[PDB]
Scaffold this motif. Structure first.
Motif, PDB file in Angstrom:
ATOM      1  N   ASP B   9       0.883   2.990  -3.432  1.00  0.00           N
ATOM      2  CA  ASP B   9       1.721   2.585  -2.374  1.00  0.00           C
ATOM      3  C   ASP B   9       2.019   4.169  -1.882  1.00  0.00           C
ATOM      4  N   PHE B  10       1.120   4.894  -1.275  1.00  0.00           N
ATOM      5  CA  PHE B  10       1.284   6.270  -0.915  1.00  0.00           C
ATOM      6  C   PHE B  10       2.021   6.302   0.447  1.00  0.00           C
ATOM      7  N   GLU B  11       2.972   7.232   0.513  1.00  0.00           N
ATOM      8  CA  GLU B  11       3.774   7.348   1.810  1.00  0.00           C
ATOM      9  C   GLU B  11       3.080   8.059   2.719  1.00  0.00           C
ATOM     10  N   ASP B  12       1.816   8.298   2.553  1.00  0.00           N
ATOM     11  CA  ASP B  12       1.121   9.311   3.548  1.00  0.00           C
ATOM     12  C   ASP B  12      -0.264   8.357   4.148  1.00  0.00           C
ATOM     13  N   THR B  13      -1.000   8.822   5.282  1.00  0.00           N
ATOM     14  CA  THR B  13      -1.508   8.304   6.104  1.00  0.00           C
ATOM     15  C   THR B  13      -3.227   8.331   5.564  1.00  0.00           C
ATOM     16  N   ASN B  22      -7.725  -6.358  -4.739  1.00  0.00           N
ATOM     17  CA  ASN B  22      -8.046  -7.776  -4.913  1.00  0.00           C
ATOM     18  C   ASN B  22      -9.151  -7.453  -5.855  1.00  0.00           C
TER      19      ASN B  22
END
Lengths: 973, 48
Positions: B9-13, B22
């Motif tokens: 859940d990384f806040e960067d792009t 999965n």
């Protein structure tokens, strides 16, 4: 400690010296005399405060009607021309010839892109646009990230080539038109007259982030007002990248809301709740949008997704009707990523009749199910948008308007009404302009009536700009006093014309920028907000002014004469004057025009020097080589005549005015003869005052200089050597001392500035002014203000001779109404002169405020520039403060206690001046301190916005709006 | 899938395709770590 009678005697001596000096050495009574001795060179004409407002309202209505007729023509021609477009698809040989703005204009480029051919313009220079302009064709602006040569834009460039004829015809009819622009739904903008764009792509170091589909005028002309309810999904699944994108998406969506739209940002994660301190729909102005933006950026993702509670919350907040709403377009924007519940039961029970559209945005990249979100969009007359990157945020959060325009285009010619926008700053650097907009419909078979497929959207939006200079030339303010003016307000509260509306953007909150996280050359963007300054934020609020406001918002005439305290030009003092507001509606549009005329300003002097001998002779009294005979002379840089231009290099302006009066005699059949005759007349009067009276006594005891300001513009300082020490503005309508001494009926002492870089303390001296008051036919008139600059040192001498200099038992100081030091008794105070008394001796000043000899009135200045904190300048709010006398009493004695000691004080107010003399026990005996009580602009943040929506101001929205048509389609999503 | 499932859940792009969201993607990432190619890039994501 002395008694009250001996102190009163000291004060009487001081006042009988000061008043006598400033009365004899200035020339009040002499100018009053000569202003009646002639009484034939001029006439006294009344100022019918009712007829002026009606004339100005008719002229503004005529101007706006002309700018509307200039719009309906463009709309008709655009519809007619696009009705007959052929939709070519190969422009290799049938190239499009056009002038793309924002391109390198060297005569060597030879771009020759695959499909079109550029034009090289001539670009003469002009006025009414302080830049270069070519009236021969129409420029074109295409957003930077849109290809200039795609097929979708090559047709909008080919069929809009028939607008230039109507542009040229519109300007040939009314030669005073500013920009005329057609902004199409494909980004392509086409304006006239052509002008190089203020920002090329990479020719400067900055880039051009402009897009016609986001401008105020376009967004207001393309859809009726809305009640948006952004609904964020902050459950656990949206964490990470998609949340960073949802924050930016909401912050770019709020940026597409005018002041007539209402918005609220709720969130939901297994439990729905609002995201800020608002709890209902707010009015989406600058401050409310700012609070919502700053509250969205704080959300975090955690929990389970439940669409039923969120949609129940949304539909409940859209069913309030207790608060003030726009009440036109109930919509809701669901910002999520994708789930598995389509929530058919909630939609069935809440909007079974399809009254509330639901636009659904799926943000970020993921592997979830976008089925139910698409279904919600398709069913509730909405639309489905996908936002997978920061790039696709600008063009996705602005397309929902194309869906809100369906019931407007499906209405016909009942939806084409000119619609002026708020006051903003032009993008081509033209100042403060308002724009009138009128949509343009797509008709491709209105005859056969079989298309109705692309004919549910609009082509674009037409617009013509009206600058707030063209309006200020319809309300001429050079026959009133410096205290009377015009002002016109929206049916929203906001002001459109005011002496206090300035070209800077209004601020919100204290500015804070973090340098440590800013790359050097990345061009952090700028703002597009309009300049929306409410009426009750450009003046001081009474309980009567709110009545006048709410009474002239809803189009009513009338007047009201009352007694209000006005603020001075320099925000340091506060007067107490009578005013007479007299409003009226502008019959055509939805504006209300008023006129603040003070008493003593219902008559004015009209110059009637018809003899050319007197005019010439008076004109010979302004040449710079004659100063030694009539003193340094200035001149207000007004529009005396369309040839000489205001310079602000006032000596050059005086030279040009002299040389223009030289060549053409003052008959002037193509020129403003009234102002010029008035200026010559008052110049004659002031020169007669200087020659006959001031020139007898070349120098006096302490008078460093004596000045005379008058209406018309002439302002004369007698000693030319002293003229170099006159920092005051040359225009006699922004001289703070002029207006102040006009309001008061006694000699006004104007304290100098403190520590400001410029010689005023011992080089200019304390200032004194008094307004000339004449009686011609039993009618009052205040045509001039005469004054004096008393020297500080001789006043110290006259003041001392038990207040001996540098004493240590008592201090004896003199202030004026406002709390500024003017004459001290310690040589440590009177070296810092003009400084706030409560900044050197805090506790005594605080007690004076406490016992109610002074009184203050804090305000807000929503247009200031400050230096940001870490958390060259930025727009900021600055809380101001102004102290003034309130009680009418003459003497105030007593004792102040602040612990283990007690000081005695006695204060007495001088007669016929605004000075107070206070004698108190010295601070060296009583060790005391509370806090520095400073009177100065303080970078502030308030007032609290979410303690103001609970009780908003009055507001009359637009009664006409288009939604919910039956023959709509909504088969798209 | 238990450890790093949904913990990117990384806040960067920056794109991180070799994740454990999965079952097929977990199989691909485990095979890539097994063949020893770029496995030290799938470890720094799991650390951060």
């Amino acid at each position: 400690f002395p008694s009250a009678v001996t102190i009163k005697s000291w004060v009487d001596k001081m006042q009988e010296d000061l008043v006598t000096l400033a009365k004899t050495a200035s020339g009040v009574h002499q100018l009053v005399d000569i202003y009646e001795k002639y009484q034939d060179l001029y006439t006294v004409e009344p100022n019918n405060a009712r007829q002026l407002v009606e004339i100005a309202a008719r002229d503004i209505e005529k101007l706006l009607s002309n700018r509307s007729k200039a719009l309906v023509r463009l709309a008709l021609e655009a519809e007619k021309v696009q009705a007959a477009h052929q939709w070519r698809e190969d422009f290799a040989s049938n190239e499009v010839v056009y002038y793309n703005a924002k391109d390198d204009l060297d005569p060597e480029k030879n771009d020759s892109e695959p499909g079109s051919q550029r034009i090289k313009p001539v670009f003469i220079d002009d006025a009414n646009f302080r830049r270069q302009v070519s009236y021969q064709h129409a420029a074109v602006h295409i957003p930077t990230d849109i290809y200039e040569g795609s097929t979708i834009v090559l047709n909008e460039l080919n069929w809009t080539s028939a607008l230039d004829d109507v542009f040229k015809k519109n300007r040939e009819e009314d030669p005073s038109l500013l920009w005329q622009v057609f902004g199409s739904a494909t980004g392509l903008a086409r304006y006239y007259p052509a002008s190089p764009w203020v920002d090329n792509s990479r020719t400067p170091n900055k880039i051009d982030l402009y897009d016609v589909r986001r401008r105020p005028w376009y967004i207001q002309g393309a859809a009726s007002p809305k009640d948006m309810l952004i609904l964020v999904d902050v459950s656990g699944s949206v964490s990470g990248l998609t949340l960073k994108l949802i924050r930016t998406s909401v912050s770019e969506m709020l940026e597409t809301l005018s002041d007539d739209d209402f918005v609220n940002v709720a969130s939901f994660n297994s439990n729905a709740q609002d995201v800020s301190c608002f709890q209902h729909l707010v009015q989406a102005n600058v401050r409310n949008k700012k609070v919502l933006k700053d509250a969205v950026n704080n959300i975090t993702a955690k929990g389970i997704t439940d669409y039923k509670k969120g949609f129940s919350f949304a539909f409940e907040q859209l069913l309030n009707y207790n608060v003030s709403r726009a009440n036109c377009n109930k919509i809701i924007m669901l910002f999520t990523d994708g789930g598995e519940e389509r929530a058919q039961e909630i939609f069935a029970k809440y909007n079974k009749d399809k009254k509330v559209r639901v636009f659904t945005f799926s943000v970020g990249q993921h592997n979830y199910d976008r089925g139910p979100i698409q279904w919600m969009a398709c069913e509730n007359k909405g639309y489905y948008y996908e936002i997978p990157s920061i790039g696709a945020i600008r063009i996705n959060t602005q397309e929902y308007l194309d869906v809100l325009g369906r019931p407007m285009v499906l209405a016909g010619d009942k939806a084409k009404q000119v619609q002026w926008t708020n006051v903003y700053l032009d993008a081509l650097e033209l100042g403060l302009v308002i724009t009138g907009t009128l949509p343009v419909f797509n008709i491709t078979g209105q005859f056969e009536n079989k298309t109705n497929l692309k004919n549910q959207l609009i082509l674009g939006v037409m617009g013509v700009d009206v600058s707030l200079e063209d309006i200020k030339r319809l309300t001429p303010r050079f026959t009133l006093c410096p205290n009377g003016y015009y002002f016109a307000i929206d049916p929203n509260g906001y002001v459109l014309l005011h002496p206090n509306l300035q070209p800077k953007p209004i601020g919100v909150g204290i500015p804070t920028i973090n340098l440590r996280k800013r790359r050097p050359n990345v061009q952090n963007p700028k703002s597009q907000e309009p300049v929306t300054l409410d009426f009750l934020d450009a003046e001081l609020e009474n309980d009567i002014k709110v009545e006048i406001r709410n009474k002239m918002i809803d189009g009513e005439s009338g007047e009201k004469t009352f007694r209000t305290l006005v603020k001075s030009q320099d925000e340091r003092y506060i007067d107490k004057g009578n005013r007479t507001y007299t409003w009226t509606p502008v019959n055509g549009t939805d504006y209300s025009l008023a006129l603040v005329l003070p008493t003593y300003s219902f008559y004015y002097i009209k110059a009637k020097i018809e003899e050319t001998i007197t005019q010439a002779r008076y004109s010979e009294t302004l040449k710079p080589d004659n100063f030694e005979e009539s003193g340094y002379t200035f001149l207000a840089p007004r529009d005396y005549c369309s040839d000489l231009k205001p310079s602000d290099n006032n000596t050059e302006f005086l030279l040009n005015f002299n040389e223009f009066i030289d060549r053409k005699t003052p008959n002037n059949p193509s020129c403003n003869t009234d102002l010029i005759n008035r200026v010559l007349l008052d110049a004659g009067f002031t020169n007669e005052l200087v020659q006959n009276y001031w020139s007898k006594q070349k120098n006096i005891k302490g008078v460093k200089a004596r000045f005379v300001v008058t209406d018309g513009g002439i302002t004369r300082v007698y000693p030319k050597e002293a003229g170099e020490n006159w920092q005051e503005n040359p225009e006699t309508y922004e001289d703070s001392f002029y207006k102040r001494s006009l309001d008061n009926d006694n000699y006004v002492f104007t304290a100098p500035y403190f520590n400001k870089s410029g010689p005023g303390a011992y080089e200019s001296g304390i200032m004194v002014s008094k307004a000339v008051e004449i009686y011609i036919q039993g009618k009052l008139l205040k045509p001039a203000v005469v004054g004096i600059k008393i020297d500080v040192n001789s006043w110290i001498e006259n003041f001392t001779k038990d207040c001996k200099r540098n004493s240590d038992v008592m201090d004896c100081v003199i202030l004026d109404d406002g709390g500024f030091l003017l004459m001290a008794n310690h040589d440590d105070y009177t070296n810092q002169i003009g400084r706030f008394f409560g900044e050197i001796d805090p506790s005594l000043m605080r007690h004076l405020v406490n016992i109610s000899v002074y009184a203050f009135n804090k305000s807000y200045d929503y247009q200031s520039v400050c230096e940001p904190g870490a958390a060259s300048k930025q727009s900021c709010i600055t809380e101001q403060t102004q102290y003034f006398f309130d009680n009418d009493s003459k003497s105030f004695s007593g004792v102040l206690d602040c612990g283990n000691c007690s000081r005695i004080f006695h204060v007495e107010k001088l007669m016929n001046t605004n000075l107070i003399f206070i004698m108190v026990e010295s601070k060296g005996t009583c060790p005391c301190d509370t806090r520095l009580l400073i009177q100065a602009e303080q970078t502030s943040d308030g007032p609290d916005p979410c303690d103001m929506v609970k009780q908003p101001r009055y507001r009359k929205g637009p009664d006409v709006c288009f939604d919910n048509n039956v023959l709509e389609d909504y088969t798209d999503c | 899938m238990q450890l790093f499932g949904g913990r990117y859940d990384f806040e960067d792009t920056e794109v991180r395709r070799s994740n454990f969201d999965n079952f097929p993607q977990a199989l691909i990432s485990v095979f890539q770590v097994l063949t020893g190619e770029d496995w030290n890039s799938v470890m720094y994501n799991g650390i951060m």
